[PDB]
Amino acid sequence: SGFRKMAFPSGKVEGCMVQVTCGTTTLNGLWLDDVVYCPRHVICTSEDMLNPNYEDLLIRKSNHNFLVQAGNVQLRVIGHSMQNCVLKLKVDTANPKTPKYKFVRIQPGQTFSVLACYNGSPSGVYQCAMRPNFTIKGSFLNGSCGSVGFNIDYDCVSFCYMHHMELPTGVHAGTDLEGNFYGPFVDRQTAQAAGTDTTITVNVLAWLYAAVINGDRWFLNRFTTTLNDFNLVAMKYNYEPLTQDHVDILGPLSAQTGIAVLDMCASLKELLQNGMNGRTILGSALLEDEFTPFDVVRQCSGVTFQ
Amino acid sequence: SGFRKMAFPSGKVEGCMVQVTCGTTTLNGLWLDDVVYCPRHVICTSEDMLNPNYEDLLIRKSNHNFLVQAGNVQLRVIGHSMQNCVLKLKVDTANPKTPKYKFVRIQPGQTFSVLACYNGSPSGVYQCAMRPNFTIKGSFLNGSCGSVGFNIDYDCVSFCYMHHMELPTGVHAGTDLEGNFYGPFVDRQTAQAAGTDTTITVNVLAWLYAAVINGDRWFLNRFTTTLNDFNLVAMKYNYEPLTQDHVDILGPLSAQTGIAVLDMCASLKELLQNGMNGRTILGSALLEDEFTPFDVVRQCSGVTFQ
Ligand SMILES: *[C@](O)(C(=O)N1CC(F)(F)C1)[C@H](C[C@@H]1CCCNC1=O)NC(=O)[C@@H]1[C@@H]2[C@H](CN1C(=O)[C@@H](NC(=O)C(F)(F)F)C(C)(C)C)C2(C)C
Ligand SMILES: *[C@](O)(C(=O)N1CC(F)(F)C1)[C@H](C[C@@H]1CCCNC1=O)NC(=O)[C@@H]1[C@@H]2[C@H](CN1C(=O)[C@@H](NC(=O)C(F)(F)F)C(C)(C)C)C2(C)C
Ligand SMILES: [Cl-]
């Protein structure tokens, strides 16, 4: 029993983290095979970052201008290219600790683990959700750029996030590993703000199933609803629309608990309209939307990774 | 910016996890050098666990009765001994991935990372606190026994917890790595309950400093208090007494923010007496007591591990 925000074990990713320095700018890189991936603004000074011309700064750089360290080992750069907002440095050494891996662009609502790094070294690990507004609610200090987000499937690391920047309200934006931002952000220091966020409904329902599984069942009412009535009531509270796909995704939890998805929807509608009235669910006084159905299943069914 | 419950990177510990089977009971073991450490009730059947005689069951076991697997590799046991509630299996292979390490018995209030495992494989990682009542609020399914808790200091893993059991209310109990339980629990299936828990005051204050650092400052009042008046008011709310040691421990955060500890104490007193009145601090609607001063410093100063 119990239900915690749980990250994926980080060891496979730890063995991929390097320090990248260019001029006086140092951040983190991801060393896979014989390529180091890092945010392309490693090639800027502070000054430059207000409105940088990245292809101009990069044309003026030679391989030797990039210092890549993996512990007390310098890796010689033998090539470099820019892919969108990500810089690729070819090195003369393939990373022996390269795991089985993919690059995935995740969808709003999907979670991942962030391995927060400084100077190519891990600080710690925690789970995040890609928010509907294409931000994450992270913990990142200066030096954290190049820190990555990932999922593990069994033996395979799916890299989905590389950290670039922090927006007002202390939320975070970055790219997939092909250097395309999530959301409308740009890698320059100018006024940008996150869009107004929404609550990930399917995830809140998953979390309500997690509660039931753990014996926290007070919020279950005797009623059902239609997907129609549910979506109308939830729109008022800034909840995303629940789709039939979302309903189908919730099937495993629904089947495990014997609670139809539209019954849980009725229970949630009552929580939204009536609030929690001094009560907690799974320790929490607010509804949690940063557990996916799969996360709930993994945690409550003990899925592991090799 | 941002403030997340962050675990230590798990890679050093992952390389130490094995599966231990004895008869039909399988759980996790910790492989350091040429010793595998696991809960001693691996040598029980279900039946046995209601009131086991561990030294009797163990005398009837031979080395070969313990199957230790590390991936698709069986490690031959060449010795076995019991230390309190922990079984030590000497194996014929020293673990090549053994990190620099210590065994520490942590104090109530101190945090650690748990690497939750099943069948010797990692499921995920999350942070916990040793509660004043010597339980942790974990996430552990059947098969999780032998999962360990740890801290990383730079390069050195301090192992402080090995998981044994789950109590009513879905909280968890276990041992240090010398097999002594935290708290009054015993490794047998009989009625045991956690003592009534208390809130870790020093940790809540640390978390209030974290909030200030992140710009969440609404709860700061203009007042100060004495350590005396604070401790009287906090006793009513089931908060632990704050000691001068705790005050001294909070010095770094106090100095960084310019807020005296007894001013923060005044702010907290007001929160306890008046509640939060619909407001959140760092995303949270309840006061959080599972971040230590050091955790706050690490996260808000970017301490890393090699
Ligand atoms: C990242 O570049 C980094 O860690 N380092 C080390 C270094 F200084 F050498 C480069 C940082 C990470 C930031 C720093 C503030 C705390 N948390 C973080 O995530 N990224 C940046 O500093 C990026 C790069 C320039 C500006 N910027 C920002 O994050 C800024 N944001 C914005 O301008 C805004 F649009 F509002 F989002 C800043 C104001 C937070 C500094 C780039 C190229 C966008
Ligand atoms: C641990 O032994 C384990 O994971 N495994 C795999 C196995 F079955 F082969 C042995 C489990 C972990 C438990 C299981 C329930 C979910 N979460 C957990 O942490 N530990 C136990 O099962 C221990 C051992 C016998 C009984 N027990 C308990 O946890 C029981 N608790 C109690 O009796 C009580 F005192 F209330 F705390 C149980 C009722 C939760 C099964 C030992 C030797 C104490
Ligand atoms: Cl909360």
B285 inside domain? yes
**Cross-chain residue pair B123–A286, CB shorter than 8 Å:** no
**Which amino acid is located at B74 in the chain?**
Q
Kindly give the distance from the C-alpha atom of residue A214 to the centroid of ligand 3, in angstroms, as a whole number. 18
Domain boundary among B41, B67, B99: B99
Nearest by CB to residue A10, choosing from B125, B298, B302, is B125
The three-state secondary structure class of B42 is helix
**Cross-chain residue pair B166–A1, CB shorter than 8 Å:** yes
**Which amino acid is located at A18 in the chain?**
V
Residues 6+ apart with CB under 8 A from B217: B211
**Cross-chain residue pair A302–B118, CB shorter than 8 Å:** yes
A13 CA: distance to closest CA in chain B (Å): 9
Same-domain status, A257 and A243: yes
Same-domain status, B207 and B254: yes
Residues B146, B163: contact at Cβ < 8 Å? yes
Nearest by CB to residue A5, choosing from B5, B14, B115, is B5
B138 inside domain? yes
Tokens for A109, please give them: 């609502």
- Tokens 């750029």 belong to residue: A145
**Cross-chain residue pair B302–A143, CB shorter than 8 Å:** yes
Instruction: Let me know the angle formed at the C-alpha of A21 by A15 and A25, rounded to the nearest 5 degrees.
Output: 125
- Tokens 């700018």 belong to residue: A25
**Which amino acid is located at B148 in the chain?**
V
In A, minimum Cα distance to B128 occurs at A4
For B146, what's the count of Cα atoms within 13 Å in the CB-facing half-sphere? 33
B306 inside domain? no
A143 inside domain? yes
Separation of alpha carbons A305 and A283, rounded Å: 27
Tokens for A125, please give them: 């690990």
Separation of alpha carbons A35 and B84, rounded Å: 50
- Cα dihedral A185/A189/A190/A192 (nearest 10): 30
Instruction: Count Cβ atoms below 10 Å from residue A252 Cβ, excluding itself.
Output: 16
A225 CA: distance to closest CA in chain B (Å): 29
Same-domain status, A226 and A130: no
Kindly give the distance from the C-alpha atom of residue B138 to the centroid of ligand 2, in angstroms, as a whole number. 13
**Cross-chain residue pair A9–B124, CB shorter than 8 Å:** yes
Same-domain status, B120 and B4: yes
Separation of alpha carbons A305 and A292, rounded Å: 18
Domain boundary among A99, A115, A140: A99
Instruction: Count Cβ atoms below 10 Å from residue B247 Cβ, excluding itself.
Output: 17
Residues A32, A97: contact at Cβ < 8 Å? no
The length of chain A is 306
Residue A269: phi, psi to the nearest 5?
A: -50, -45
B167 CA: distance to closest CA in chain A (Å): 10
In B, minimum Cα distance to A13 occurs at B11
Report yes or no: B72 at the A interface, CB cutoff 8 Å.
no
Residues 6+ apart with CB under 8 A from A36: A18, A20, A29, A30, A68, A75, A77, A88, A89, A91
**Cross-chain residue pair A214–B170, CB shorter than 8 Å:** yes
Same-domain status, A218 and A114: no
Same-domain status, A55 and A171: no
Same-domain status, B206 and B294: yes
Separation of alpha carbons A93 and A70, rounded Å: 11
Tokens for B109, please give them: 């209030």
Expressed in Å, this structure's resolution amounts to 1.9
> For helices B293-301 and B201-213, what crossing angle results, to 10°?
20
In B, minimum Cα distance to A280 occurs at B286
CA A32 to chain centre: 20
Same-domain status, B268 and B139: no
Burial A146-160 (b: 16+ CB within 10 A, else e): bbbbbbbeeeebbbb
Residues 6+ apart with CB under 8 A from A294: none
Any ligand 1 atom below 6 A from CB of A25: yes
> For helices A201-213 and A293-301, what crossing angle results, to 10°?
20
Element (H, E) at B256: helix B251-257
**Cross-chain residue pair A123–B14, CB shorter than 8 Å:** no
B251 inside domain? yes
Q: Where are the beta strands (DSSP E) in chain A?
A: 17-22, 25-32, 35-39, 66-70, 73-75, 77-83, 86-91, 100-103, 111-118, 121-129, 148-153, 156-167, 171-175
Beta pairing partners, B18: B29
Separation of alpha carbons B29 and B105, rounded Å: 18
Give the A window 109-168 contacts with B, CB below 8 Å: 115-119, 121-126, 128, 137-141, 143-144, 166
Report yes or no: A96 at the B interface, CB cutoff 8 Å.
no
Please list the active-site residues of A: 41, 145
B22: containing domain? 15-99
Please list the active-site residues of B: 41, 145
Same-domain status, B111 and B5: yes
Same-domain status, A181 and A241: no
Report yes or no: A83 at the B interface, CB cutoff 8 Å.
no
Find which of A14, A121, A139, A290 to mutate to test the B interface (most B CBs within 10 Å of its CB).
A139
Domain boundary among A164, A197, A230: A197
Same-domain status, A183 and A104: yes
Q: Give the CATH number of the domain where residue A44 resides.
A: 2.40.10.10
Report yes or no: B279 at the A interface, CB cutoff 8 Å.
no
Residues A138, A128: contact at Cβ < 8 Å? yes
Kindly give the distance from the C-alpha atom of residue A167 to the centroid of ligand 1, in angstroms, as a whole number. 8
Nearest by CB to residue A166, choosing from B1, B6, B301, is B1
First and final C-alpha spacing in chain A: 23
Kindly give the distance from the C-alpha atom of residue A116 to the centroid of ligand 1, in angstroms, as a whole number. 15
Nearest CA among B137, B140, B79, B130 for reference residue B106: B130
Q: Give the CATH number of the domain where residue A231 resides.
A: 1.10.1840.10
A242 inside domain? yes
For B233, what's the count of Cα atoms within 13 Å in the CB-facing half-sphere? 16
Give the C-alpha distances (Å, rounded to integers) separating A89 from A35, A53, A58, A68, A302.
5, 19, 12, 9, 38
Burial class (CB within 10 angstroms; exposed 0-12, middle 13-18, buried 19+) of B258:
exposed
Nearest CA among A178, A158, A148, A172 for reference residue A87: A178
Report yes or no: B14 at the A interface, CB cutoff 8 Å.
yes
CA A188 to chain centre: 21
DSSP A243: P
Residues 6+ apart with CB under 8 A from B284: A286
The three-state secondary structure class of B113 is strand
Nearest by CB to residue B141, choosing from A10, A12, A302, is A302
Q: Which of A44, A47, A84, A166 to mutate to test the pocket of ligand 1 (most atoms within 8 A of CB)?
A: A166
Residues B202, B234: contact at Cβ < 8 Å? no
Separation of alpha carbons B174 and B179, rounded Å: 8
Burial A60-82 (b: 16+ CB within 10 A, else e): ebeeeebebbbeeeebebeebeb
DSSP B278: T
- Please give the interface size between A and B, counted as residue pairs whose CB atoms are below 8 Å apart: 156
Query: Atom of ligand 2 at shortest distance to CA of B186?
Result: 44
Instruction: Count Cβ atoms below 10 Å from residue A88 Cβ, excluding itself.
Output: 18
Instruction: Let me know the angle formed at the C-alpha of A248 by A110 and A152, rounded to the nearest 5 degrees.
Output: 35
Instruction: Let me know the angle formed at the C-alpha of A46 by A42 and A47, rounded to the nearest 5 degrees.
Output: 125
Same-domain status, A131 and A254: no
Element (H, E) at A56: helix A54-59
Chain B residues inside the 8 Å CB shell of A122: 9, 11, 304-305
Nearest by CB to residue B6, choosing from A9, A139, A300, is A139
In A, minimum Cα distance to B285 occurs at A285
Ligand at minimal distance from the CA of B183 is: 2
**Cross-chain residue pair A124–B298, CB shorter than 8 Å:** yes
Any ligand 1 atom below 6 A from CB of A21: no
Separation of alpha carbons B227 and B261, rounded Å: 9
First and final C-alpha spacing in chain B: 23
**Cross-chain residue pair B122–A305, CB shorter than 8 Å:** yes
A306 inside domain? no
B48 inside domain? yes
Domain count of chain B? 3
Instruction: Count Cβ atoms below 10 Å from residue B100 Cβ, excluding itself.
Output: 12
Chain A residues inside the 8 Å CB shell of B15: 11
